[PDB]
Design a protein around this ligand. Structure first.
Ligand SMILES: O=C(O)Cc1cc(I)c(Oc2ccc(O)c(I)c2)c(I)c1
Length: 247
């Protein structure tokens, strides 16, 4: 009765087993979104920083937390726990830059035109560029300004995160056909959650599924910026986890 409800033009809202998952998933997001005061605490980085290595510096610091937020949200999901140590790791390395991105874009203030990193620092497109990310920063900023229209909610950001995390495409995965079922499950629940929210933007699900791809790009480019970085005459200022995540 899914494809059917489609043809009759009804938009299926979540079901019992789904509103469950949605809760289980929404909670995580919220239990790791330290949220009510970022636009408040957000420290504007001195514009003379990143006009780079200095700005890179900052970023580098306040990043270990940012990676853990992803790490902790994954810990809460029983789907992510049913999987091996190995896939678990793979999965987190794969989705990490994707999640921090969302986290970065959802915190975009169209006003001062900056993104807020780690819920503390506020930087401009130029600062994030010259800091060591180049194009990716335009990709994250541009994403942000697009999401400032999707008006996502804790659930929507959360389930997004979830779809990012359960990627059966990551190289090395062992339990492939199972992470897919888990993904497939999240996607469905997302759509349904979407219908239930009934936004007023046509193609919301298609539009939104494109951000998933976009985030995957940023993610891919970021791996390429992470190589252009390791040079610069490497070593120092590269936090251990930041290094383990992306190798
Ligand atoms: O904190 C969050 O939750 C999100 C977050 C944190 C930071 I610091 C950030 O900037 C990056 C990311 C990768 C990278 O290689 C470099 I240098 C800087 C992004 I974009 C997002």
């Amino acid at each position: 009765m899914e494809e059917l409800q489609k043809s009759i033009g009804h938009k299926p809202e979540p079901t019992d087993e789904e509103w469950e998952l949605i809760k289980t998933v929404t909670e995580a997001h919220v239990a790791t979104n330290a949220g009510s005061h970022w636009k408040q605490k957000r420290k504007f980085l001195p514009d003379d920083i990143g006009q780079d290595l200095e700005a890179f510096s900052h970023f580098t610091k306040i990043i270990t937390p940012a990676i853990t937020r992803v790490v902790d949200f994954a810990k809460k999901l029983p789907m992510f726990c049913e999987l091996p140590c190995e896939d678990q790791i793979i999965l987190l390395k794969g989705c990490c830059m994707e999640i921090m991105s969302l986290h970065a874009a959802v915190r975009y203030d169209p006003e001062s035109e900056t993104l807020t990193l780690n819920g503390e620092m506020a930087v401009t497109r130029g600062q994030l560029k010259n800091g060591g990310l180049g194009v990716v920063s335009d990709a994250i900023f541009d994403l942000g300004m697009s999401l400032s229209s999707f008006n996502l909610d804790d659930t929507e950001v959360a389930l997004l995160q979830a779809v990012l995390l359960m990627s059966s495409d990551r190289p090395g995965l062992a339990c492939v056909e199972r992470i897919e079922k888990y993904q497939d499950s999240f996607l469905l629940a997302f759509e349904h959650y979407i219908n239930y929210r009934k936004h007023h933007v046509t193609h919301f699900w298609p539009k939104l599924l494109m951000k998933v791809t976009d985030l995957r790009m940023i993610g891919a480019c970021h791996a390429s910026r992470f190589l252009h970085m390791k040079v610069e005459c490497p070593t120092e200022l590269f936090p251990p986890l930041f290094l383990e995540v992306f190798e």
